[PDB]
Design a protein around this ligand. Structure first.
Ligand code: CL
Ligand code: NA
Ligand code: NA
Length: 128
């Protein structure tokens, strides 16, 4: 399925080239511009654990998730991966724990040492 495909066929987007964050573009977005550090970014997402359980979805809440890019407000895989996206793009990201919640995990649903799969849509980005 999609997690296996990104694991085996995804592109390493890390600057370290350590395969910690792998990406596949699923829906090509608009234009060429990617968001800037500090921009307000608006995303829809769904996350799954490696055991197949869905742990989060903004679609289910009927509102996007909003954060300032490149500020550590989200897991490192999201700062790195959203910075590569175009407006309107949908991608899959596979996130090793070193780019996610590490040995701590995150209650209630994310265990220690968890590799995470996301589908992310970049809805919009705005500076000031
Ligand atoms: Cl799938
Ligand atoms: Na596929
Ligand atoms: Na892109």
């Amino acid at each position: 399925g999609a997690p296996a495909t990104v694991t085996e066929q995804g592109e390493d987007i890390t600057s370290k080239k350590d395969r910690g964050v792998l990406k596949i573009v699923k829906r090509v977005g608009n234009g060429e511009e990617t968001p800037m550090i500090g921009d307000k970014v608006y995303v829809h997402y769904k996350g799954k654990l490696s055991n197949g359980k869905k742990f989060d979805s903004s679609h289910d809440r009927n509102e996007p998730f909003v954060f300032s890019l490149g500020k550590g407000q989200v897991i490192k895989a999201w700062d790195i991966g959203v910075a590569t996206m175009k407006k309107g793009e949908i991608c899959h990201l596979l996130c090793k724990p070193e780019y996610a919640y590490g040995s701590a995990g995150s209650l209630p649903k994310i265990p220690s040492n968890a590799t995470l799969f996301f589908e992310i849509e970049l809805l919009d980005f705005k500076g000031e």
